[PDB]
């Protein structure tokens, strides 16, 4: 099934402006230190996925070269 976080990104209708918007709403004032540490980690994981996808991309494009 894979991780929601990564699968979410494979969704055509996934819109980045939308996702961040729903996320940050949880909510502000004082407890914006709370959500500030949550986003740090969430960012790290997105970062991992970013490089994973880049690696998958690189590997895929190589096969385009006469198989």
């Amino acid at each position: 099934a894979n991780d929601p976080l990564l699968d979410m990104f494979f969704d055509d209708d996934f819109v980045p402006q939308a996702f961040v918007d729903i996320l940050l709403s949880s909510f502000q004032t004082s407890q914006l230190e709370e959500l500030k540490t949550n986003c740090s980690s969430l960012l790290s994981k997105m970062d991992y996925y970013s490089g994973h996808i880049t690696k998958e991309l690189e590997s895929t494009i190589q096969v385009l070269q006469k198989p």
Binding site: F9, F10, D12, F14, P16, Q17, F19, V20, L23, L24, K36, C39, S40, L42, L43, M46, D47, Y49, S50, I53, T54, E56, L57, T60
Partner: peptide
């Protein structure tokens, strides 16, 4: 994969702007 890469980058950038 190009699309997924671009979507992750946008999500990442926006989220960091917010941060």
């Amino acid at each position: 994969l190009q699309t997924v890469s671009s979507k992750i980058h946008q999500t990442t950038t926006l989220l960091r702007s917010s941060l």
